[PDB]
C-alpha cells in the first residue's frame, strides 16, 4: 500500500514535469509552472473536464496530446482505485 | 482478464466503426474519421461531458442517438471496472 | 441480482414519473415528457453535469429541487455499484 | 458502518462551516450560507465541475483554495466508497 502510494507520487511528479515542458508555453494557465501542472493532472485524474475542458483545446495546438493524457488517465485511475481497495483490505 | 481486455478492444473498435458511419457527416469534430471516434468514445466511456457535451447536441440531429450511447456506456463502464477488479484479484 | 435490477427499474420509472410532473412545465427540454426525464435521470445518475448543468438552473425556479435529486443520486449510485458488484460476485 | 456515516457527517458539516467562512463573501452563490456550502461540497464530493466550475474560479481570488478542496476530495471520496463497500460487506 505504502509502495503503491510511493509509485503514484513518483509517476505524478514525473508526469507534471513532462506536462510542464510539453504544453506550458502554449497553455500557461494549465501547465505554466510545475505547480499549475500537478493541479491540472490531479483534475484530469479525477476526470473533471479532462477532454472538452483540457485535452480537446490542448490537441488543437498539439494533435498527439492524447498519447500522454489517455495513458496517464489509464495508469493513475487504475492505481488510485487499486490503492484505495488496498487500504480497505488492510 | 486477457479475454476481457480482448472483448473490450473488439467492442471499442466496432462501436467506433459504427459511430464514424452514423454521426461522422453531421458531427465531424467528434466522429469524422475512425480516430476521432475512438477518442470520443473513450471520453464518453469515462463519462466526461457524455450528455450535455456530446449526446444532447448529437440527439438534436439524430433523435434516437441514445439507443447507441446509453447501451455503449452500460456495457463499457461495466466491463472496464470488471476488468480492473479482475487485475486486482489475479494480483492477490 | 435480478431483484436489484427490478428495484432499480421500479425506482427509475417512479422517479421519472415524479420529475416529469415536478419540473416538466418549467424545464421542458429536460423533463417535458416521461422519455426526456428517463434520459435526464440516467444522466444525473452517471453524474454528468448533475449540478451546474441540471440541479443549479432547476433550483433557480424550484429552490428545494435538491430534496429530490440528492436522495435520487444517493440511492441510484449506491444501487448501480451494488448491482455491478453482485454481477461480478455471481 | 454507522461510525463511518457519523464521521462523514461531522467532517461534512465542519467543512461546510469552514468553506462558508472562507469563500462565502467572495463567492455567495456557492458558499453564502451554511446551506449553499453543504450543497456545493456534496457536488464537489461527487466531482461534478469541481475544478473548472468551482475551484479554478475560486482560486482566482484565493490562490491556495486547493489546500482545502484537494484534501476534502481525497478524504470524502475515500470515505464514501469505503462506507458503501462496508454496507455491501455487512449485507453479505
Ligand atoms: C496526487 C496528489 C496531487 C496533488 C496536487 C497539488 C496541486 C498543487 C497546486 C498548487 O500548488 N498551486 C496551484 C497552481 O494552479 C499553487 C498556487 O496557488 C501558488 O500561488
Ligand atoms: C481503449 C483505448 C482507446 C484509445 C483511443 C485512442 C484515440 C486516438 C485519437 C487519435 O489518434 N487522434 C485524435 C482525433 O481527434 C488523431 C490525431 O492525433 C491525428 O492528428 C494524428 O495524425
Ligand atoms: C436505467 C435505465 C435508463 C434508461 C434511459 C432511457 C432514456 C430514453 C430516452 C428516449 O426515449 N428519448 C430521448 C428523450 O430525450 C426519446 C426521443 O428520442 C424520442 O424522439
Ligand atoms: C452528506 C449529505 C449532504 C446534503 C447536502 C444538502 C444541501 C441542502 C441545500 C439547501 O438546503 N439549499 C440549497 C442552497 O443552494 C437551500 C435552499 O433549498 C433554500 O431555498 C431553502 O429555503
Ligand atoms: Br478508466
Ligand atoms: Br455518491
Ligand atoms: Na463537466
Ligand atoms: Na465525471
Ligand atoms: Na464521475
- For B26, the 3-state DSSP assignment is coil
Q: Are D41 and D23 in contact (CB under 8 A)?
A: no
Q: How far apart are CA A35 and CA A13, in angstroms?
A: 10
Name which of A76, B74, B57, A88 is nearest C46 in CA terms: B74
Resolution given for this structure, in angstroms: 3.2
Separation in Å, CA A12 to CA A16, A79, D35: 6, 11, 35
For A25, counting Cβ atoms within 10 Å of its Cβ (0-12 exposed, 13-18 middle, 19+ buried), the class is exposed
Q: Whose CA is nearest to atom 16 of ligand 3?
A: C35
Q: Whose CA is nearest to atom 11 of ligand 2?
A: B35
Output the CA angle B11-A56-B44, nearest 5 degrees.
Answer: 30
Other CB atoms within a 10 A radius of the CB of residue B59 amount to 15
Task: Say which CATH number the domain at A87 has.
Answer: 1.10.287.70
Q: How far apart are CA D36 and CA D16, in angstroms?
A: 9
Q: Are C27 and C69 in contact (CB under 8 A)?
A: no
Q: How far apart are CA B83 and CA A56, in angstroms?
A: 27
Chain-chain contact of B42 with A82 (C-beta, under 8 angstroms): no
Neighbouring residues of the ion ligand 8, judged by CB less than 5 Å = A 47; B 47
Q: Which atom of ligand 4 is nearest to the CA of D39?
A: 7
Chain-chain contact of A52 with B53 (C-beta, under 8 angstroms): yes
Q: How far apart are CA C85 and CA C75, in angstroms?
A: 16
Other CB atoms within a 10 A radius of the CB of residue A22 amount to 16
Boundaries of domain holding C86: 1-90
Q: How far apart are CA D88 and CA D92, in angstroms?
A: 7
- For B29, the 3-state DSSP assignment is helix
Q: How far apart are CA B57 and CA D81, in angstroms?
A: 33
Q: Which residues lie below 8 Å from residue C23, measured CB to CB, with a gap of 6+? A: C30, C31, C58, C61, C62, C65
Chain-chain contact of A49 with B47 (C-beta, under 8 angstroms): no
Q: Which residues lie below 8 Å from residue D68, measured CB to CB, with a gap of 6+? A: D15, D18, D19, D22
Q: Which residues of B touch C47 (CB under 8 A)?
A: 47
Chain-chain contact of D47 with A48 (C-beta, under 8 angstroms): yes
Q: Does A46 touch chain B (CB under 8 A)?
A: no
- For D92, the 3-state DSSP assignment is coil
Q: Are D16 and D72 in contact (CB under 8 A)?
A: no
Chain-chain contact of C53 with B50 (C-beta, under 8 angstroms): no
For C3, counting Cβ atoms within 10 Å of its Cβ (0-12 exposed, 13-18 middle, 19+ buried), the class is exposed
Q: Which residues lie below 8 Å from residue A40, measured CB to CB, with a gap of 6+? A: A19, A30, A31, A54
Q: Does B88 touch chain A (CB under 8 A)?
A: yes
Other CB atoms within a 10 A radius of the CB of residue B11 amount to 15
Instruction: Give the distance from residue D70's alpha carbon to the nearest chain A alpha carbon, in angstroms.
Output: 9
Q: Which residues lie below 8 Å from residue A61, measured CB to CB, with a gap of 6+? A: A23, A26, A27
Q: How far apart are CA D64 and CA D69, in angstroms?
A: 10
Q: Are C79 and C44 in contact (CB under 8 A)?
A: no
Q: Residue for cell digits 429541487?
A: C65
Per-residue DSSP letter, D62: S
Among the bound ligands, the one closest to the CA of D46: 6
Domain count, chain D: 1
Q: Are A24 and A31 in contact (CB under 8 A)?
A: yes
The total number of residues written for chain C in this structure:
90
Q: Whose CA is nearest to atom 12 of ligand 2?
A: B35
- How was it solved? X-ray
Pocket residues for ligand 2 (CB within 6 Å)?
A 63-64, 66, 70; B 12, 35-36, 38-39, 42
Q: Are C30 and C36 in contact (CB under 8 A)?
A: yes
CA dihedral A19, A20, A22, A27 (to 10 degrees): 100
C-alpha cell at A5: 502510494
Instruction: Give the distance from residue D20's alpha carbon to the nearest chain A alpha carbon, in angstroms.
Output: 23
Q: How far apart are CA D39 and CA D20, in angstroms?
A: 11
Residue D27's φ and ψ, nearest 5 degrees, are: -130, 70
Cα maximum dimension of chain B: 48
Q: Which residues lie below 8 Å from residue B31, measured CB to CB, with a gap of 6+? A: B19, B20, B22, B23, B24, B37, B40
Other CB atoms within a 10 A radius of the CB of residue D47 amount to 17
Q: How far apart are CA B3 and CA D62, in angstroms?
A: 49
Q: Which residues lie below 8 Å from residue A50, measured CB to CB, with a gap of 6+? A: A43, A44, A69, A73, B43, B46, B48
Rg (CA), chain C: 14
C-alpha cell at D68: 482545502
Q: How far apart are CA C53 and CA C47, in angstroms?
A: 10
- Per-residue 3-state assignment (H helix, E strand, C coil) for chain C: CHHHHHHHHHHHHHHHHHHHHHHCCCCHHHHCCHHHHHHHHHHHHHCCCHHHHHHHHHHCCCCCCHHHHHHHHHHHHHHHHHHHHHHHHC
Output the CA angle D46-D47-D53, nearest 5 degrees.
Answer: 130
Q: Are C70 and C59 in contact (CB under 8 A)?
A: no
Amino acid at each position: 500500500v505504502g509502495s503503491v502510494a510511493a509509485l503514484l507520487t513518483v509517476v505524478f511528479y514525473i508526469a507534471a514535469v513532462m506536462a510542464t515542458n510539453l504544453y506550458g508555453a502554449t497553455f500557461p494557465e494549465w501547465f505554466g509552472d510545475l505547480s499549475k501542472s500537478l493541479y491540472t493532472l490531479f483534475q484530469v485524474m479525477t476526470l473533471e473536464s479532462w477532454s472538452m475542458g483540457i485535452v480537446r483545446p490542448v490537441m488543437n495546438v498539439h494533435p498527439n496530446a492524447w498519447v500522454f493524457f489517455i495513458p496517464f488517465i489509464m495508469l493513475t485511475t487504475f492505481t488510485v482505485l487499486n490503492l484505495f481497495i488496498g487500504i480497505i483490505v488492510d
